[model samples]
Target chain A: KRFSSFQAAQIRIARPTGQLDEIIRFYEEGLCLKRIGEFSQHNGYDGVMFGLPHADYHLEFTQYEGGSTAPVPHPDSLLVFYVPNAVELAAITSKLKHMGYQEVESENPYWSNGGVTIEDPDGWRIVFMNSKGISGK
Target chain B: KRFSSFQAAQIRIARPTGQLDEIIRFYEEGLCLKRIGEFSQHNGYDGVMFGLPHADYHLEFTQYEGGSTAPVPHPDSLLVFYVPNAVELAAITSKLKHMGYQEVESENPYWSNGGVTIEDPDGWRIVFMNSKGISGK
Candidate 1:
């Protein structure tokens, strides 16, 4: 039997040593979407959680600071959104990836509501779509 | 106007070299939870994600070339989970903290969510019972 649950997603970025508001404004202004909330945990990492526009998911932006640089592979993981049909999924994911974005998984499981996903410039993913009939443990 | 959406909470946990299993046991067994999914992500900062038992929230356990260390106060941050009420929250949180867990916000919010939170002995947070009126954002 299953139990209560909450949802969350994250994009790891190069540790930002500067103003976080700049990062938020740049994304909010240059991009079109909504913000959920941002906070500093004092554990050292800073993050902003929010809902993505025109997408059926929410993601949080996080960064690690005062450390060696990290290099995440291009298009390996995703915010895989399961869309009802492949047509809309392909359309949106394709447009976003083409905007200098990258693919998170070119080999997404075909049975998964045939969805689309994109990787942001910072090598994080943003996916939008639907999921049905797929059983997650 | 309110638009509905979903957010996915994620985390990064660093482990001591060759100690991924330690984190796993702490989360899956010690914490009495089940495994959701496990994979190696482009060799991220030694990261692994585990869903808490009964609760759908996840805990990411990570470790780098070096074995995991405590009190770093970076990369690994504090995480809070929603629970039913403060009595349970205080009992569990206090017990855990007494068992050598890390202590973060030692006091209540003073405004809402009449709950207390304690950092794990490992430095991660067990953000416990938030009152009905308290908002995490």
Candidate 2:
């Protein structure tokens, strides 16, 4: 069996000024996504990093040093991840919360007996769900 | 044969704000993702719209509203969309390029050869790909 790796998550927000740091601030301080490895850096043009335990895929962040913008994905564009425990996820979620991430939402609403939901200034949904992994990255 | 209405192109992301609407503006106004549906707003919760094709899906955006904060998705989490026309996408891409979403890393950053990438203020990845509809999204 050929096992593959590569989970994807999207976030749409501010135009990212040069203030956002690469290693400490953005990588560690901001998102708390463990920076396992690095791929590239074009003066804030773009960059990719490996994160988490069995990191599904690369954690990528790109800042268009130029004035180039793209369309908002289908509002539903989501990268859902089913975790073993929501309590343990606090470390990650707390960071987002501290930084100001909104609640994570589930499609079923009451299906999971109530899950968390959060959104960025860009309208990207971050759902902290548990149970069947019906949703994809 | 099953000719079901297509589901929205779902892409997950991370949020660092408790403000769902702020994120909404980013997508609706910044990214330009069309308006579709919303979920997890009832019972004092938060979620998303799941994007759209026919109200089937929209990867909807939901940051745990009210008093909840969304948890960070798995590192490998990914969201992919099968858009129409590479040339046409180029036009959209050009518009984005002009607006400035930022180029993805890797000669082939996304899962395909024809796509652009960007990150929200929260450091989540978003891909705009024009694949050949390989698996039928």
- Native interface contacts retained, candidate 1: 0.03
lDDT of 2 by residue, A1-137 (tens): 01011111222221222322432353355445555444345543554342422132234444445532323423344444444355544555567677755664444445346345555444444554544333323
Task: Considering only chain B, report the TM-score of each candidate against the true chain B.
Answer: 0.51, 0.57
Error of 2 at B7 (Å): 14
Candidate 2 lDDT over B1-137, as tens digits, reads 01111111222343334567756755665555645555555666565442332222234445544454433422223344334456655655465456555545532334446665554433354555664323211
Encode model 1's per-residue lDDT on A1-137: one tens digit a residue. 12223221221111232345544643453233466656665345566655443222234455544432222322323333434455555655555545555555543343123445554555434555454312225
Cα lDDT, model 2, residue A109:
49
Candidate 1 chain B, run of 10 with poorest lDDT: B8-17
The ten-residue window of minimal lDDT in model 1 chain A covers A6-15
B108: Cα error in model 1, Å: 14
The lDDT, on a scale of 0 to 1, for candidate 2 is 0.42
Can you give the TM-score per candidate against the true fold?
0.48, 0.39
